[PDB]
Amino acid sequence: SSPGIWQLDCTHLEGKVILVAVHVASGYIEAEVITGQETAYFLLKLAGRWPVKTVHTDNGSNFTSTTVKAACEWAGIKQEFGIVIESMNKELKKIIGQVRDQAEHLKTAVQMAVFIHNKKRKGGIGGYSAGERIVDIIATDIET
Amino acid sequence: SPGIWQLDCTHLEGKVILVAVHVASGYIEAEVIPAETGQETAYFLLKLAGRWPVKTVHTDNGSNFTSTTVKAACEWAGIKQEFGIPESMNKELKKIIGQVRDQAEHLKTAVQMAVFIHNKKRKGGIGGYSAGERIVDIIATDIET
């Protein structure tokens, strides 16, 4: 339920690395091609617009980065180890496939792929998209 | 004022800060972008419209109308561009950056630090809702239809 849990993981394509944050409760994601500085900055930018409370990671890299440790402290985020995404860096890989032609730089193509994911109906028809649903989840938690 | 944004450039430490403002909420998003308005300005908006609903984008100078790349980005993402930007958040954003500038090496971070603060403060102490609170309520509301 919690409106501010996320997962974080990397994924590689065309030699460059793609950091991916997924809001678990909704499936809304954000991504970017990238250091621990980069991730720290990435997280700072993310915490600065969504409720980013706890970040789950599946390896130890992030718990060694000084800046990251400084970012979470500054923004008030709990790193957690432990844990949807492998089912979801493959869709992103799929969508990036259909757009890579449209983009000079890989980095535009990811954001295109991001665009698609958050805008399309999660159900393929009717209901909400992920971008709508994250907003809905958050709206319902403040009025608490 | 559902998906209406306003766009502007601000300057400090010999760098260019692009600033997107959601009109009805005061919600802001910014980034360090080149003097040249073009590819990276188009990239900024693509990411922006991936995060939020973005239908219209106002400006009151011609820079955003000079770039082939920006025109395609708005075309690709379904945005509308309109001249005339009918705000001064740049006044207080620079104040906060000045406040938090010591706590980071890169101006970049300080900016995102200031962005963070501007969008999260109010309902604070009393207040009612911050920009970030306001944008979410506006959007969640509109989706009702």
Ligand SMILES: Cc1ccc2oc(C#Cc3cccc(C(=O)NCCOCCOCCNC(=O)c4cccc(C#Cc5oc6ccc(C)cc6c5CC(=O)O)c4)c3)c(CC(=O)O)c2c1
């Ligand atoms: C407490 C705490 C917490 C967290 C923290 O974190 C950090 C950090 C950091 C850091 C790390 C390393 C470098 C730098 C840096 O100094 N950084 C300079 C500048 O950085 C800003 C700019 O960054 C580069 C972005 N550049 C682009 O995006 C780009 C470039 C070129 C082209 C394009 C494009 C496009 C595009 O768009 C389109 C849209 C639509 C369509 C149809 C087409 C297109 C196209 C074209 C295409 O089709 O391809 C984009 C900063 C700190 C800092 C500290 O520890 O004290 C910190 C501290």
